[PDB]
What we know:
By secondary structure, the first copy, chain A, is mostly loops. Chain B: This is Spike protein.
Amino acid sequence: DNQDIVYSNNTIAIPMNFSISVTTEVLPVSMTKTSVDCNMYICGDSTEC
Amino acid sequence: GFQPYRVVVLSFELLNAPATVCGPKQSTELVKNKCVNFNFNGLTGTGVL
Lengths: 49, 49
Ligand SMILES: *[C@@H]1O[C@H](CO)[C@@H](O)[C@H](O)[C@H]1NC(C)=O
């Protein structure tokens, strides 16, 4: 959204009140650990392979 | 190379339909809840029934 602000060389804006805000920020940390068996995937119940 | 020959051509399908023609294999009383190497009309493999 536009704001069309103007420049004044002898005027300053100063706040007259304040507020306290609480914000949320979520970050991932870890992931699932997985073990893989080489046989029972490529093979299984098969001694020939 | 000019004497008559008798030719017989046999066509069959394997392991994808109910079967009615098998070879001379003697059957075995089945057991359950144990992993054994089975044979069901030519379908081998080891597993729990
Ligand atoms: C600042 O904001 C609070 C909360 O709305 C209000 O009660 C208070 O009067 C304000 N103070 C001034 C100086 O405007």
